[PDB]
Ligand binder design. Sequence first.
Ligand SMILES: Nc1nc2c(ncn2[C@@H]2O[C@H](COP(=O)(O)OP(=O)(O)OP(=O)(O)O)[C@@H](O)[C@H]2O)c(=O)[nH]1
Ligand SMILES: [Mg+2]
Ligand code: NA
Lengths: 187, 163
Amino acid sequence: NDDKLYRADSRPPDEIKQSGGLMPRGQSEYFDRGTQMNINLYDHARGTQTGFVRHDDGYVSTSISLRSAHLVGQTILSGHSTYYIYVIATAPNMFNVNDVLGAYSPHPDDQDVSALGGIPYSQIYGWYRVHFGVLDEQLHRNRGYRDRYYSNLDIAPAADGYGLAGFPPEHRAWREEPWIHHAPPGS
Amino acid sequence: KEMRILMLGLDAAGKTTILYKLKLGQSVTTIPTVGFNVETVTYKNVKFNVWDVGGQDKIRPLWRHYYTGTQGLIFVVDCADRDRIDEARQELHRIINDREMRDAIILIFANKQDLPDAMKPHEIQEKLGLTRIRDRNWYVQPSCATSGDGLYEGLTWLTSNYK
Ligand SMILES: Nc1nc2c(ncn2[C@@H]2O[C@H](COP(=O)(O)OP(=O)(O)OP(=O)(O)O)[C@@H](O)[C@H]2O)c(=O)[nH]1
Ligand SMILES: [Mg+2]
Ligand code: NA
């Protein structure tokens, strides 16, 4: 109920506050051109043909530890002299990607916990500033964090994410447990 | 006086519109909600903590994970959507029969009353099978979320009926 998650992000806290939280890529896409957000967990995990993030992505990735988020930062945000690691409470729009996609998880070493629809600002406990790749400062607490909202909630159980795996229609996972019980017609 | 409110309903019913009409006093352009929105609003001395959870079919299994602590359910219906009123009934009764929801009072927003052939509260009460609910209070409040009509009347009912 009161575990935290960790998200490396180049956007600073004032920008996040103004956006209302950590929003998915697909949200701006929807508002800008009407495209519906893609909530296929598999598509979020695999990304684009070229392996990049999809424009219509409905999910926001987080890490399960500080060390892991720092690694994400030093991999994806290596080009940024300053970035942030956001500390986030748990809520039931969050899915453990490897648990939902099972053995078909395309990048299981990510150990990603992903938030469907984004993470509201009130769910953000605080943040670490990372400068030149080093965490040299203590956590800064978010005054807008609301612990009473989240302390009684946990991430979604994998059983309730299987229906959101969203493998392509002809993918063999739909003929196997557990996803067979959510299979699209003909899959 | 705080009450934790869970606001549920089929996709497109007008839940998010309600939340931000109440919160911001404005009619906002919404995105279909795939996770949740949460805001707190104070009215007639009551601090309502309102959870707006997405209603698309694929994510309704997630609703139960917000039930604990809920003191009032707001169930929002699109009164112009006759094709899906039976589905709304089925989802309502699935919610209120969960043991974690037994004590929650139930405000139905019969929303989009501005639309031409919209079903009125009496019809909504009958099509949602509300008289089969005999162990908590419930009320059908007509509303137009876009204009705000009915919304504070609904919160007043909530205030009057929880203790
Ligand atoms: N005509 C009319 N349209 C309304 C009314 N209330 C909401 N809407 C519109 O209905 C559409 C859906 O409203 P939302 O508030 O996004 O619906 P929702 O219940 O949050 O849908 P999900 O996020 O999918 O769960 C929007 O275009 C709203 O402006 C109303 O009273 N009358
Ligand atoms: Mg919504
Ligand atoms: Na939590």
